[PDB]
Amino acid sequence: LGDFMDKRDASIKEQLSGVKDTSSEVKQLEEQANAVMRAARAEISAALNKMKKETQ
């Protein structure tokens, strides 16, 4: 019965460390979306400045 108490709190703390882990992955994934999106716009801007200077 003490082992089953440990199993109850063990499942619960497993869900708890899992939600901390997925929250870390959540902030990582959202900053990765922002990074790749703003970075793609930065790529396009730098590329257009380069090509327009060259053709000019």
Partner: peptide
């Protein structure tokens, strides 16, 4: 809490990949 947050993680995956 774990359910909603891992759901939010799959939504962040979808958002990241599709905005990319």
């Amino acid at each position: 809490l774990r359910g909603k947050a891992i759901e939010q993680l799959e939504k962040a995956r979808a958002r990241l990949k599709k905005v990319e």
